[PDB]
Amino acid sequence: SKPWNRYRLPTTLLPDSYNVTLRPYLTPNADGLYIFKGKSIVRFICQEPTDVIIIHSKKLNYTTQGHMVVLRGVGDSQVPEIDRTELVELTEYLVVHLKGSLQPGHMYEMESEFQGELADDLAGFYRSEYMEGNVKKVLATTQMQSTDARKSFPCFDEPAMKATFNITLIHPNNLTALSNMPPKGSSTPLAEDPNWSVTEFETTPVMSTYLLAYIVSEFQSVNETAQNGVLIRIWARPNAIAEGHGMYALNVTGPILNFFANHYNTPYPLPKSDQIALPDFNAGAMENWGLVTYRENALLFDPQSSSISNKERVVTVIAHELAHQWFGNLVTLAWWNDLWLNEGFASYVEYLGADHAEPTWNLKDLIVPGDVYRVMAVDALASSHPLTTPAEEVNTPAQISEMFDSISYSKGASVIRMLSNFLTEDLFKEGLASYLHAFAYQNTTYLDLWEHLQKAVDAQTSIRLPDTVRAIMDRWTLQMGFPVITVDTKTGNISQKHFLLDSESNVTRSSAFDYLWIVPISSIKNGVMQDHYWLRDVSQAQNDLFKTASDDWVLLNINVTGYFQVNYDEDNWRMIQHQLQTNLSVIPVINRAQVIYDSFNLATAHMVPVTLALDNTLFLNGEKEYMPWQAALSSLSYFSLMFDRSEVYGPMKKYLRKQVEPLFQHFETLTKNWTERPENLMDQYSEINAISTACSNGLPQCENLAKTLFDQWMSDPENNPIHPNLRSTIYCNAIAQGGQDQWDFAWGQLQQAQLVNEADKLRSALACSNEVWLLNRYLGYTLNPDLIRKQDATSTINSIASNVIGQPLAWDFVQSNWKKLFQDYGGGSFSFSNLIQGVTRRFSSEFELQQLEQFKKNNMDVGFGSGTRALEQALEKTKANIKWVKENKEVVLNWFIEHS
Ligand SMILES: *[C@@H]1O[C@H](CO)[C@@H](O[C@@H]2O[C@H](CO)[C@@H](O[C@@H]3O[C@H](CO)[C@@H](O)[C@H](O)[C@H]3NC(C)=O)[C@H](O)[C@H]2NC(C)=O)[C@H](O)[C@H]1NC(C)=O
Ligand SMILES: *[C@@H]1O[C@H](CO)[C@@H](O[C@@H]2O[C@H](CO)[C@@H](O[C@@H]3O[C@H](CO)[C@@H](O)[C@H](O)[C@H]3NC(C)=O)[C@H](O)[C@H]2NC(C)=O)[C@H](O)[C@H]1NC(C)=O
Ligand SMILES: *[C@@H]1O[C@H](CO)[C@@H](O[C@@H]2O[C@H](CO)[C@@H](O)[C@H](O)[C@H]2NC(C)=O)[C@H](O)[C@H]1NC(C)=O
Ligand SMILES: *[C@@H]1O[C@H](CO)[C@@H](O[C@@H]2O[C@H](CO)[C@@H](O)[C@H](O)[C@H]2NC(C)=O)[C@H](O)[C@H]1NC(C)=O
Ligand SMILES: *[C@@H]1O[C@H](CO)[C@@H](O[C@@H]2O[C@H](CO)[C@@H](O)[C@H](O)[C@H]2NC(C)=O)[C@H](O)[C@H]1NC(C)=O
Ligand SMILES: *[C@@H]1O[C@H](CO)[C@@H](O[C@@H]2O[C@H](CO)[C@@H](O)[C@H](O)[C@H]2NC(C)=O)[C@H](O)[C@H]1NC(C)=O
Ligand SMILES: *[C@@H]1O[C@H](CO)[C@@H](O[C@@H]2O[C@H](CO)[C@@H](O)[C@H](O)[C@H]2NC(C)=O)[C@H](O)[C@H]1NC(C)=O
Ligand SMILES: *[C@@H]1O[C@H](CO)[C@@H](O[C@@H]2O[C@H](CO)[C@@H](O)[C@H](O)[C@H]2NC(C)=O)[C@H](O)[C@H]1NC(C)=O
Ligand SMILES: *[C@@H]1O[C@H](CO)[C@@H](O)[C@H](O)[C@H]1NC(C)=O
Ligand SMILES: [Zn+2]
């Protein structure tokens, strides 16, 4: 095959530098089409002779005189004539056929004039439309990530083919231009038309095409300067800067950059950091070097309405993207098969960098619930895959997009956290710096990081490993999943096997290592740290570390640094149960959560009885902390999904009423009758949860608290007395006890609500009514754009259906109106996949399964839009629910009655 029919560029030509000039036309040509025009010069060097130049180019029309490009040699160098220039749409190339051959060592210059659509497609140079008062606003902006730089100018669009960039923006004279670097001086008017200005930027460092940004907008900024001269900014809409919504972002940014310079032991590699908050940026955040983009809602904070988990969301999201300004942007993985390393690393260090920024919080631990047990859910299936793909299997752009998933991000973060711990942080940082210094401004594989990490381990004696860093990490990176470690504390025998939540699963993917790992096992005996231990690549082993006496106990994986789950024999489970029931402080708080999360998974797997899982929740009546309570609530939400319309819900609610009441009393005292919030994050979280859990399980005191506070608010609309933290539980539980006086009030608020995060709580709360007629009225309002935004409709319908009274109303509403695929699939995508997956989440009977097969029957026409085969996932899921409910409804019921 010809080289223009392969997806990977040649390596015969390498870029040195590009001059790129873009001119976006923010006012359409009256046909309705917005466009941009560009000019580009790329200077590249020749490595081996070639008579063809191949460069990426996507949805660009060339307007160059004669051929699609003009070509020159730098200095005294001469260049062959062009024979022709073709576009090849499939592999996204511009091809320049030459009448002779480029020559090794010579630099050449390629020049193009072009234009494309300035579409609202969140790819390449694109447009974004927002509303400032009456007026329509239209900005230009970029998302290059993955393979879209080539959509904006022609370039050697692969991550390792790095170069310098001289960016110019030609824009309307009263707008501001931003790019990766500072602007060169002052904008000056365009000679041919002085309504336009021309802003030139300082030349970039050597960098990859996918990290470019340019933005033309009205935005303004709050600014700060660190002592070391680095100019920091938060850019947003004019009305948003004014309200001080940029202030939290500006406050944490400095500290975060400081933390990472010390952590990476390398200084921020650029003169400034712009961070910009864009309306409707649905990729969420993009770590463009020196110009990081966020959806507006994620960056911005309003402290008078936002809860602590908005605040925690802002700081972590900021820490993630700023971590990339070194690891990712300064040192760059060579190809998209290694994206796990880049995104995993960031996904892990986001916690460290934010822990520093809010010093008295302890954010670090939140990786356990938020990432580790989250990904474990999907990595303990047979449909999973290993972190590494071979390079030669990732070629197309669609294949490249498949790299951006839960495994890449969260398991990446999880094995890297594990790696760091077993080495120790100090050792981890040593080889981490060694990697950056050595590779700065160049490209790497994950093998390069291991080699440097090896170098640091080799350079000391204290920390000893069963094998090389590569051999150990090959077990976590080349095969999918993770082990379950079983411990018989009678003999001290210890085993391992690939853990799968379905005990009847058929793993078809085969591993070089036959699902055997090398596993770091930290251990605690009667509350006291033991020697660290390594389980080798064997199914069975024995060690006296794990042998218990009659009245000793043993617990594995401290702080759940290891990426595995633990099962012990029944005697040791009970000793741990007694221990937690009598003095919970002897077991660290992450492991009080572990014992819960792990046993529920071990139950689903038929490796313990489900009653054992439920026994591990018993100690919670004494538990003051976030994470144990969180583990129980997450593990029990499926139970609630299957049983909230059955005989089981009574004994269940009564059990949670009994367990959470002491914790509610505690916060009534600690907060001084709900007037002032707890000190740190973890305790505010525990509180938010205790109130939530009290109210939904129908404790009389939380019910009373809500009615009060919502009444105080109704007699004084302008002075909201409910702290932001507690609003979603108060709002929901007071609309439930009330009727149309409380519902019509909150709908008056939601229609007038300015902020997105208030409106989300109001919408969700409006779906907690127990009046059938209100919910059916609400469902009617979801398909009216004036009342409910198109993009909120399916969200809103799900909130209604989450309400048990709402389940049959939503199902009838979906089924009936389903035909409006052909207004909201050509009316917009509409997320049919999400709607169905939510409205049918509960279905757990033979009768309901037939109703889904019966709904299915209108195959003719309609189709399912995108959510075709999320309807098969429903039917599959439904079968698996029926089967689970038969096996469990009996024993669960007895267990809850027995313990309430
Ligand atoms: C990529 O863009 C660069 C920035 O625009 C270009 O570099 C600039 O080129 C100009 C000439 O092309 C130089 O400016 C002035 O040019 C006049 C010609 O009318 C000369 O007499 C002067 O020597 C010069 N002015 C002064 C005060 O010296 C700039 O010197 C130069 N700017 C830089 C390097 O920052 C590149 O040429 C362009 N690349 C390609 C391949 O075209
Ligand atoms: C990049 O090039 C594309 C392909 O050359 C352009 O798309 C074509 O633009 C044509 C002319 O501008 C359009 O043709 C017809 O024009 C009449 C005259 O006014 C319209 O009413 C018609 O609706 C239209 N014909 C049809 C069938 O719609 C076409 O829309 C289109 N043709 C093809 C073959 O793709 C892009 O305009 C151009 N884009 C940029 C940003 O430069
Ligand atoms: C982008 O601008 C930079 C710096 O302003 C240019 O780098 C210069 O390149 C010239 C011509 O090869 C050299 O003689 C100079 O030594 C370089 N100057 C500096 C300060 O590094 C770069 O050439 C420009 N890019 C393009 C594609 O023309
Ligand atoms: C930048 O200049 C343009 C040039 O016309 C302004 O556009 C007008 O803005 C006013 C007030 O907001 C509107 O009533 C007009 O309808 C706008 N005209 C067009 C064609 O859009 C623009 O508002 C200026 N803005 C800033 C922030 O400088
Ligand atoms: C970000 O920091 C600024 C100050 O560096 C904080 O602003 C405070 O708010 C009061 C309100 O009366 C101002 O008068 C003062 O300028 C500020 N200082 C103090 C100590 O209150 C701002 O609140 C910070 N924002 C966040 C969300 O942390
Ligand atoms: C990707 O990075 C490697 C380094 O990881 C670059 O190769 C280094 O280049 C400098 C100058 O070429 C040399 O001093 C070293 O000998 C090279 N190291 C090697 C070969 O391992 C490499 O050029 C980069 N690739 C691309 C496409 O830019
Ligand atoms: C703990 O480890 C060993 C396996 O190496 C087990 O002991 C063996 O049990 C089998 C019974 O089929 C005998 O053939 C071997 O002779 C035994 N070896 C001994 C006692 O040294 C032991 O059963 C394991 N305990 C468990 C799984 O609870
Ligand atoms: C397990 O995690 C806890 C935090 O969840 C660690 O306890 C902290 O340890 C540091 C320094 O080692 C102390 O300054 C803090 O006072 C402790 N904080 C809290 C909130 O307890 C504990 O060290 C971890 N244990 C292991 C073995 O890693
Ligand atoms: C529980 O044990 C810890 C640590 O060994 C001790 O500090 C604490 O006072 C004990 N609490 C009770 C109630 O016995
Ligand atoms: Zn990232």
From TrEMBL:
It comes from the Eukaryota. GO terms for cellular component: plasma membrane. Binds 1 zinc ion per subunit. GO terms for molecular function: alanyl aminopeptidase activity; metallopeptidase activity; virus receptor activity; zinc ion binding. The active site is at residue 321. InterPro entries: Aminopeptidase_N-like_N, Aminopeptidase_N-like_N_sf, ERAP1-like_C_dom, M1_APN-typ, Peptidase_M1, Peptidase_M1_aminopeptidases, Peptidase_M1_dom, Peptidase_M4/M1_CTD_sf. Pfam families: ERAP1_C, Peptidase_M1, Peptidase_M1_N. It is a single-pass type II membrane protein. Zn(2+) binds at residues 320, 324, 343. It catalyses: Release of an N-terminal amino acid, Xaa-|-Yaa- from a peptide, amide or arylamide. Xaa is preferably Ala, but may be most amino acids including Pro (slow action). When a terminal hydrophobic residue is followed by a prolyl residue, the two may be released as an intact Xaa-Pro dipeptide. The keyword Calcium does not apply. It is found in: Cell membrane. SUPFAM superfamilies: Leukotriene A4 hydrolase N-terminal domain, Metalloproteases ('zincins'), catalytic domain. Residues 553-879 form the ERAP1-like C-terminal domain. Residues 248-476 form the Peptidase M1 membrane alanine aminopeptidase domain. Homodimer. Interacts with SLC6A19. This is Aminopeptidase. It comes from Sus scrofa (Pig). The lineage of its organism: Eukaryota, Metazoa, Chordata, Craniata, Vertebrata.
